[PDB]
Design a protein around this ligand. Structure first.
Ligand SMILES: *[C@@H]1O[C@H](CO)[C@@H](O[C@@H]2O[C@H](CO)[C@@H](O[C@@H]3O[C@H](CO[C@H]4O[C@H](CO)[C@@H](O)[C@H](O[C@H]5O[C@H](CO)[C@@H](O)[C@H](O)[C@@H]5O[C@H]5O[C@H](CO)[C@@H](O)[C@H](O)[C@@H]5O)[C@@H]4O)[C@@H](O)[C@H](O[C@H]4O[C@H](CO)[C@@H](O)[C@H](O)[C@@H]4O[C@H]4O[C@H](CO)[C@@H](O)[C@H](O)[C@@H]4O)[C@@H]3O)[C@H](O)[C@H]2NC(C)=O)[C@H](O)[C@H]1NC(C)=O
Ligand code: XJK
Ligand code: CA
Ligand code: CL
Ligand code: NA
Ligand code: ZN
Length: 808
């Protein structure tokens, strides 16, 4: 109930929300069916349109008019946005030369430059270049301000997850908005685009920018606009609020456009009908900037022009149907479209089995346009698992395709030519970022970055302390002229031991053998030097990784590699080695095929044992530093140390072997040498975070050897590839991956072929940021470089996507 009898007189677009059933006059009241009776008449005036004309200049104020052209309008804050152009001979903002904004140029009583976020739905990154002819206002913001060639959204690349990720800095699994449609089993409640459930606060976790601001004494405009408020009125309202007295005036505002997404769905991302919505958005930017200039705020306000996701060509005839795969199609609920999420239609059905569902969906047709995953097996870069609203079964749908349950769902539940939602590394899902204002840099292009990073910057722009979030604060300092945040490196928590020779071979009863008793101060001094670290500067190029949790571990030096060996997990946390452009690949000698060697620096009690692997019929082992890349025959023995061994399924060893034998060398030739850091990851509860020992669900049979869920590698070289990786004077270049450690290669439909046809494709899907590895391991990398720490943060957030170059 709302007592709609009260009145909006002097309350139009009020900022505090009045508690029901007092009637509302704020910008969301329509959405709630709760506006006062006179809201439309008073607050949504439209008479005369939105532009001054020659003949309105100096008019006597008529309060009925949508906006005013009278002499008093500047100080009332309510002129048409083009008032000074038409009536005072001023130029439009877009017609002015751009001029660096070195300092904020703000009216008196402004305590900080205000922030205005101009968010546009479905604004695909290539529109910046492809529509530049019809968007001069946007083009000027882009060329004069700071811009990225594109910005990466979060998965899924849908509106509500991205809007709220923008607002909170959090992955959808943490903020809770995991799709446009959701079921929460604990509330037994459903969230949908249409309807009132979406308004319930329980869906929205984390702390969005407006709440962060409010809590810290920074006033915020109300960010959300009822759909029937036209864009012109949204702009005028923001501008009116900007005229409030100092003590009442917000410092942060949002405008939202439903375009170009809306037309994009109907016409496709480059339909000829798309020119007009792009022109109209640009005109709205024009209105805002002319309005700021009238208020003398165009060199005072920071403006962020930001999209949520792009748009791809998708039509009804590119739909896959679960009914062509599944026998019991009516025993499941599917969330359909550009992703698939599956659960049991009823919780009382105990004949529901995920494994059989996954199998009926795995590599079943030649050209299959979606791939089933249990959510914990999805690419860790998606961070899409640790939420009860995300169904255990997931379908990653190929770009340009839909998945649906049955053909009737598509003609009774074609109409559309565009959609979005696909994997966030897909080129057509990329969106835009432009920052313009005193706090942003002048004419600066910055590399592509992820939208999870912006909450921190928005907080920096307003002098706020960000709530805890998934951005890496400092990684976007390079976008800013001032207000940079200067983070410190985290402190190391555990210091390593440096064990020397402490154990005789006969103390080890591990059931391991090696044909190695097949052996002076020429070499005998040289080996001692190598075991004490004489080559460490070659193989440990950026310092040792720091351990940021309490544990017991040893540093182990070798000719060809250095490792941080965990006495708790019985394997290295990391293994670091450098392969130059010139290194050669050898094979494992025949006599060394099953060789494993006790490490006389590390006790029997803290070593793996070969017998466990022998007894465990599912589990084999591999090596972290690869024997194929040994610098010499003698050095090769080091690679067979029990301390360099890790458990691997035979199916995974196919992947790992090819990476270590073929691919490391390939990257060293292409990148002029590479440094590799590899190790295990344990994330049994799929939370993206390092497991403690008591969270491990699988061990090598009969032992306390924990089985990794994933293996990572970080591959660093010199960004200027004319310099070798081990003598790099400047910026670095990185790619990383987090490969799932799976007992089968079901994920790879072409796996029965030779690894040269399928392994590299798998590795690309599981591309990762260094930061994702840090969360997963409790390690901090790149602690000793010659680079600034902010630059290194930006490196750690880098994602190598393998997409072709954005454009054409
Ligand atoms: C991305 O950035 C974020 C933000 O930093 C990272 O997420 C944080 O991770 C923290 C560490 O894991 C986690 O800390 C826990 O908080 C618990 C208190 O939780 C509430 O309070 C906070 C504070 O305001 C709030 O933000 C939380 O919000 C979550 O839940 C609400 C309501 O359900 C949702 O609205 C919201 O969406 C959010 O959900 C997300 O997080 C929860 C987990 O908190 C998930 O379950 C959801 O799926 C979703 O992802 C909460 O309202 C606190 O109780 C925890 O403490 C336990 O564990 C510690 C170990 O040190 C121990 O000291 C305690 O004993 C305690 O154990 C007890 O509970 C256990 C579980 O029931 C039980 O097993 C034990 O036996 C004990 O009884 C813990 O400190 C933090 O809450 C989240 N924050 C957010 C916003 O998600 C995220 O990790 C980052 N991701 C990556 C990849 O880096
Ligand atoms: C992709 N979108 C956004 O990021 C976004 N959208 C907004 N509005 C405002 N009014 C509105 C009405 C809608 O429906 C009518 C709507 O539907 C989906 C969305 C919105 S505000 C905003 C935003 C602005 C700043 C920050 Cl920090 C975070 C988010
Ligand atoms: Ca974990
Ligand atoms: Cl969804
Ligand atoms: Na075995
Ligand atoms: Zn859309």
């Amino acid at each position: 109930w709302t007592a709609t009898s009260g009145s909006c007189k002097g309350r139009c677009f009020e900022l505090q929300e009045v508690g029901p059933p007092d009637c509302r006059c704020d910008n969301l009241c329509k959405s709630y069916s709760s506006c006062c009776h006179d809201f439309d008449e008073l607050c949504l005036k439209t008479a005369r349109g939105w532009e001054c004309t020659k003949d309105r200049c100096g008019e006597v104020r008529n309060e009925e008019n949508a906006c005013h052209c009278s002499e008093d309008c500047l100080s009332r804050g309510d002129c048409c946005t083009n008032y000074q152009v038409v009536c005072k001979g001023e130029s439009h903002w877009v017609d002015d030369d751009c001029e660096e904004i070195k300092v904020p140029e703000c009216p008196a009583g402004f305590v900080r430059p205000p922030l205005i976020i101009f968010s546009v739905d479905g604004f695909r990154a290539s529109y910046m270049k492809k529509g530049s002819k019809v968007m001069p206002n946007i083009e000027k913001l882009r060329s004069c301000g700071t811009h990225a060639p594109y910005m990466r959204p979060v998965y899924p690349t849908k509106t509500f997850p991205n809007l709220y990720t923008l607002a909170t800095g959090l992955y959808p699994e943490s903020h809770g908005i995991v799709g446009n449609s959701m079921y929460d089993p604990v509330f037994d409640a459903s969230f949908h685009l249409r309807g009132r459930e979406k308004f319930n606060h329980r869906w929205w976790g984390g702390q969005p920018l407006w709440i962060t601001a409010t809590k810290q004494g920074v006033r915020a405009g109300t960010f959300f606009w009822s759909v029937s408020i036209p864009h012109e009125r949204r702009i005028l309202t923001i501008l009116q609020w900007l005229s409030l007295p100092d003590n009442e005036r917000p410092s942060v505002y949002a405008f939202y456009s439903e375009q170009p997404d809306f037309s994009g769905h109907k016409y496709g991302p480059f339909g000829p009908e798309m020119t007009n919505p792009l022109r109209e958005i640009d005109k709205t930017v024009g209105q805002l900037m002319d309005g700021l200039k009238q208020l003398r705020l165009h060199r005072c306000v920071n403006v962020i022009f930001v999209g949520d996701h792009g748009m791809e060509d998708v039509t009804c005839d590119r739909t896959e149907f679960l009914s062509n795969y599944l026998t019991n199609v009516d025993d499941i609920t599917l969330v359909p479209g550009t992703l698939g999420r599956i659960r049991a239609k009823s919780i009382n059905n105990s004949k529901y089995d995920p494994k059989t569902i996954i199998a009926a969906l795995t590599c079943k047709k030649p050209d299959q346009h979606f791939k089933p995953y249990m959510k914990q097996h999805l690419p860790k870069r998606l961070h899409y698992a640790n939420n009860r609203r995300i169904e255990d079964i997931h379908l990653l749908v190929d770009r340009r395709w839909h998945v649906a349950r049955k053909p009737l769902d598509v003609y009774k539940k074609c109409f559309f030519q565009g959609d979005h939602g696909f994997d966030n590394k897909v080129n057509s899902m990329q969106t835009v970022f432009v920052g313009y204002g005193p706090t942003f840099k002048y004419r600066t292009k910055v590399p592509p970055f992820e939208n999870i990073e912006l909450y921190n910057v928005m907080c920096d722009l307003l002098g706020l302390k960000p709530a805890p979030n998934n951005g890496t604060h400092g990684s976007l300092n390079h976008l800013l002229r001032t207000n940079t945040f200067r983070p410190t490196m985290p402190d190391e928590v555990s210091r390593p031991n440096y064990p020397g020779i402490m154990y005789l071979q006969s103390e080890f009863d591990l059931g391991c053998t090696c044909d190695d008793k097949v052996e002076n101060k020429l070499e005998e001094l040289n080996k001692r030097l190598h075991t004490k670290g004489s080559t460490k500067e070659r193989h440990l190029l950026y310092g040792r990784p720091a351990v940021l949790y309490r544990t017991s571990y040893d540093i182990l030096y070798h000719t060809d590699f250095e490792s941080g060996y965990s006495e708790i997990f019985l394997m290295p946390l990391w293994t670091s080695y450098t392969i130059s452009k010139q290194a050669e690949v050898s094979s494992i000698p025949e006599h060394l095929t099953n060789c494993v060697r006790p490490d006389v620096r590390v006790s029997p009690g803290f070593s793996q044992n070969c017998l466990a692997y022998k007894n465990d019929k599912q589990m084999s082992y591999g090596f972290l530093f690869p024997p194929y890349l040994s610098s010499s025959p003698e050095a090769k023995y080091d690679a067979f140390l029990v301390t360099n061994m890790v458990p691997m399924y035979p199916a995974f060893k196919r992947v790992w072997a090819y990476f270590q034998r073929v691919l490391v060398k390939k990257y060293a030739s292409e990148r002029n040498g590479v440094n590799v850091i590899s190790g295990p990851i344990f994330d049994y509860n799929y939370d993206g975070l390092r497991d403690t020992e008591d969270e491990i669900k699988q061990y090598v049979e009969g032992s306390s050897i924990p089985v990794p869920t994933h293996y990572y590698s970080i591959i660093t070289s010199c960004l200027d590839f004319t310099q070798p990786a081990d003598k790099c004077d400047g910026p670095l270049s990185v790619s990383s991956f987090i490969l799932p450690h799976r007992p089968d290669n079901d994920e790879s439909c072409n796996s029965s072929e030779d690894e040269s046809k399928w392994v590299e494709e798998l590795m690309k899907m599981h591309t990762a940021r260094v930061r994702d590895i840090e969360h997963l391991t409790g390690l901090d990398f790149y602690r000793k470089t010659s680079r600034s720490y902010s630059e290194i943060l930006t490196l750690k957030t880098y994602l190598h996507t393998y997409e072709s170059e954005i454009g054409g």
